[PDB]
Amino acid sequence: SLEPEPWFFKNLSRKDAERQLLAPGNTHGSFLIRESESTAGSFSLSVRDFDQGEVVKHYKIRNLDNGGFYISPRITFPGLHELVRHYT
Amino acid sequence: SVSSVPTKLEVVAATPTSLLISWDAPAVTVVYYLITYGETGSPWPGGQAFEVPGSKSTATISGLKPGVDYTITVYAHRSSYGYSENPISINYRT
Question: Are A44 and A62 a contacting pair, CB within 8 Å?
């Protein structure tokens, strides 16, 4: 279902995402979406950010009872596409 | 100034490891709430979050590390998807 989307990285560990995002060629705010080892069948967003070194910040994509998603409870979305569109 | 949904929020029962929060049942319809909690000064989303249905006016937070300052914030959603209403926050040292 997500396989067609370029931003979705299948079979990508949390640590592999750190390496992928820290690798050269990635500007700041470079990101991807991965399957969550963190929590069963849900997804996570990993992003390139700088901490007073450069780093990868992981954000859990949490699900709603209505099937939607959110990272921050201030804004919720029907699907990931909408979430990803918003956070870009 | 600026006013929030829900309007008032307080801890009505504490143990060293958990808290029962209660808030004023709002006048407007809320489909669901989302509630964050984490150590005061956690970033960015604020810590762990969970959902409670709109009909409810209480939530129980548990598995807390005892004697630690927590920020607890409630977000009210008045439609299925979109922006939450202005949230309300409280701080509590377990």
Answer: no
